[PDB]
Amino acid sequence: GSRFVVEKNNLKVTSPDSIKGIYECAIGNFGVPQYGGTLVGTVVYPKSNQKACKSYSDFDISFKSKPGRLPTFVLIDRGDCYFTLKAWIAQQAGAAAILVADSKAEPLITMDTPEEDKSDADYLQNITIPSALITKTLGDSIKSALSGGDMVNMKLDWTESVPHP
């Protein structure tokens, strides 16, 4: 299918300054309420299981945020399994949102394949977290910032057909 809708205005990196800006993303239509909203969080790129095709419990990895601390957006690499399985697996591990970074530098629409965007309703209708495809360029920029010791904070704004501030 194409369940991931390419939007130019829906994803904002708020920190650090080096990568701060607004980026394109493809937001899944599932996992969000049917009304407008935003989610503010901080990005984690896991040490293992980076494609989220296995249980994070096998790795003793959890994304649950401590009370009072920003919700965790998990950065996940494209490959080996379909996108809603990645979202489901990240969700079981306590992720507040998932960003799936393309393995190729290319237009986002090309990443939404029939092989990776699957119709299974058990997965689609049980995802509760925002799920977005992002470019290799953004994925690499986020990884670079994180490796340098910076927190990467982000906002996902999904309200359709209205500009975002």
Word description of this protein:
By secondary structure, the protein is of the alpha/beta class. The protein has a single domain (1-165), classed as 3-Layer(bba) Sandwich (Glucose Oxidase, domain 1), CATH 3.50.30. The protein is 18% helix and 28% strand. The chain has four helices and seven strands. A seven-stranded mixed barrel has the order 1-2-6-5-4-3-7. The longest helix has 12 residues, at 136-147. The chain is globular and about 40 Å long. This is Vacuolar-sorting receptor 1. Residues 34-146 form the PA domain. Interacts with the N-terminal propeptide of ALEU and the C-terminal part of the 12S globulin CRA1 in a calcium-dependent manner. Binds to EPSIN1. It is found in: Membrane; Golgi apparatus membrane; Cytoplasmic vesicle, Clathrin-coated vesicle membrane; Prevacuolar compartment membrane.
Give me some keywords for this one.
165 residues; seven-stranded mixed beta barrel; Glucose Oxidase, domain 1; alpha/beta; monomer; globular
What's the quick description here?
Belongs to the VSR (BP-80) family. This is Vacuolar-sorting receptor 1. This protein is α/β, with parallel strands linked by helices.
Give the topology, please.
Layout: E1 4-15, E2 21-28, E3 38-44, E4 72-77, H1 83-92, E5 97-101, H2 108-111, H3 121-124, E6 131-134, H4 136-147, E7 153-157
Parallel strand pairs: 3-4, 4-5, 5-6
Antiparallel strand pairs: 1-2, 1-7, 2-6, 3-7
PDB class: protein transport
Keywords: Ligand-binding domain, Apo form, protein transport
Assembly: monomeric
